[PDB]
Design an enzyme around this catalytic site. Structure first.
Site, short mmCIF file in Angstrom:
data_model
loop_
_atom_site.label_atom_id
_atom_site.label_comp_id
_atom_site.label_asym_id
_atom_site.label_seq_id
_atom_site.Cartn_x
_atom_site.Cartn_y
_atom_site.Cartn_z
CB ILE A 1 -0.97 0.01 1.21
CG1 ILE A 1 -1.93 1.19 1.10
CG2 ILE A 1 -0.19 0.08 2.52
CD1 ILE A 1 -2.82 1.15 -0.13
CG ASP B 1 -8.36 -5.50 4.21
OD1 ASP B 1 -8.11 -5.00 3.09
OD2 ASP B 1 -8.24 -6.72 4.46
N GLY C 1 -5.27 -6.81 -0.44
CA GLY C 1 -6.01 -5.96 0.48
C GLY C 1 -5.16 -4.76 0.84
CD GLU C 2 -0.83 -4.38 2.57
OE1 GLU C 2 -0.31 -3.40 2.00
OE2 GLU C 2 -0.20 -5.43 2.80
N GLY C 3 -5.95 -1.98 0.82
CA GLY C 3 -6.44 -0.85 0.04
C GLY C 3 -5.68 -0.72 -1.28
#
Lengths: 333, 333
Positions: free
Chosen positions: B83, B160, B301-303
């Site tokens: 991210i 997330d 994930g992590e955006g």
């Protein structure tokens, strides 16, 4: 080639589950191998939009007057085109190369005037251009890329602008890949069955003047477009300069096919920005063995699809810059 | 709403064939309607990564130790995560919000410490959290977005980080959409049949404590995760602030579903950054009625997926800034 191995080994140790960054992991590795670096570097990008008119517009293959090409070129220089807007959002320089537009064009900082001839001849009734002109178009293409490169380009895309170039693109593609008109002909700038018929026929006419043994450039001279050859030159120069090369749509990728047939390993430097709506584009990407980074149902050209993908390529380049589990103190399981 | 009409009328007059910019034309129009502008403006972006641990890790649903969540948070603050790399390439600010990580975290400029509790309780054996905690998680989410917004965010994504959150995400999704475990359970951070079985069972256990009438937040409190609720809060705040909201993967989109169930029209502000590998993601996007901008087989994930799409959203925003045929002196046929 320890770099290929090392980059691959680092990828496996980055802080994320295995395969978690999907197709971008492959892109990252290719970018790594291209630059001979474990941690690839990318910055300023450049797109060279090659413009030229086609004599085949006489067969009624486009829904736009021939004059739109010249008009759009002025649009490019004034920043009112899509390619201008996307390049602004992608930190991409924009160069415009006139190699065959019908009509004069005033001197302009962002324009390289190298008109090979006022549009090609009707490809449906004879060679689109002569071998000497094809060589000049290729040279003009390499010249423009060279300048883009000298000015700091780290990623290079090619763009197209030529009313009626989807026909020339289809003929050039069908010829280089041994495909029938039916497989390479599509909507173009928006045509119905009458248009499609006329395009397939023009392609068929061109393919009938070809024979085994003819080299790729000779084929391009007979059935393509001046800007398509120029585009092949743009990619050839970028390839020789060792830069990552980004593909746009059907007409631009057709030029990439020519470059590839002239330089076998050039495919190692190609990245497909997207899969356009043009049916023939799939065939080109399958032969090039490339997976499209984007699929947004685009059908414009100008290099828009390629430029839209630059940010992704930069993001992929940063993947190997992530910390490994050991470097970050993160348990691996 | 003359703006919706005017923007649509201008789109039809831009210098390019009709529908030539495909799905990006729709995005451009939505962005236009959102800002109440014919020519949408976008700049600096922001992503708020919400982190929290899950008591359900006890059921053995992840391939990583619980400690990876806290460790990854430190990784975020030090810039060694994916991210961080993608946000750097997308002109996106990165904020990290701790709402339920197990363990203490030092003060840090890019971290908002709002620990609701040391991880949720095992969702497979009882309510993940209490109603009061769910409300605090939601509040923490809104607080973080508010700060991101106050600091100049023009586009807002949520991220997330929570080992075992794909299970909580599946339960929350199955509950809000009335879907069975089998439809929302997948690979997660990389699990085989034994893992999948254990996840489906945990989801089933949670769904069995639910009943008709329960409001969305009450459902989230019972079967979700603290960070998933925080994410719902991030989107709620962004929505109220009238900003374009970008979706990431399955866990993040699960939080968006909660926000949506709590605020009906919020979907008007959502843009799906991508379609992850998680099978359940398709279901979420179908219910939200959104088309993914990217499909790169991502599963992190992590955006990351949301941030990777920001450049595209900015490019789409520029489409209406193109010149019309009249403005550019280009013939339309």
């Amino acid at each position: 080639p320890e770099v290929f191995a090392q980059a691959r080994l680092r990828m496996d140790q980055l802080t994320k589950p295995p395969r978690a960054l999907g197709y971008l992991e492959e892109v990252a590795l290719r970018l790594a191998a291209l630059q001979g670096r474990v941690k690839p570097e990318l910055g300023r990008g450049a797109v060279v939009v090659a413009a030229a008119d086609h004599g085949v517009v006489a067969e009624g293959v486009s829904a736009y007057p021939q004059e739109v090409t010249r008009q759009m070129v002025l649009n490019f220089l004034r920043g009112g085109a899509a390619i201008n807007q996307f390049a602004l959002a992608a930190d991409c320089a924009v160069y415009v190369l006139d190699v065959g537009v019908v009509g004069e064009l005033p001197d302009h900082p962002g324009l390289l005037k190298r008109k090979v001839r006022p549009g090609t001849a009707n490809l449906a009734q004879g060679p689109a251009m002569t071998p000497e002109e094809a060589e000049r178009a290729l040279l003009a293409g390499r010249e423009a890329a060279r300048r883009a490169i000298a000015e700091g380009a780290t990623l290079l895309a090619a763009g197209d602008m030529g009313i009626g170039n989807t026909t020339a693109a289809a003929a050039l593609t069908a010829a280089l890949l041994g495909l029938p008109p039916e497989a390479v002909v599509g909507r173009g700038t928006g045509v119905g069955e009458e248009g499609l018929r006329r395009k397939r026929q023009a392609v068929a006419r061109a393919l009938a003047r070809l024979h085994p043994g003819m080299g790729p450039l000779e084929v391009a001279a007979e059935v393509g477009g001046i800007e398509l050859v120029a585009i092949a030159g743009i990619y050839l120069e970028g390839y020789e300069a060792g830069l990552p090369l980004v593909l746009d749509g059907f007409p631009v990728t057709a030029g990439a096919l020519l470059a590839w047939k002239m330089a076998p390993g050039l495919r190692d430097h190609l990245f497909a920005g997207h899969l356009s709506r043009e049916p023939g584009h799939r065939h080109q990407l399958e032969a090039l063995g490339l997976r499209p980074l984007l699929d947004l149902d685009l059908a414009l050209g100008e290099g828009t699809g390629a430029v839209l993908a630059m940010p992704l390529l930069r993001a992929a380049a940063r993947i190997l810059h992530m910390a490994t589990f050991q470097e970050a103190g993160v348990s691996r399981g």
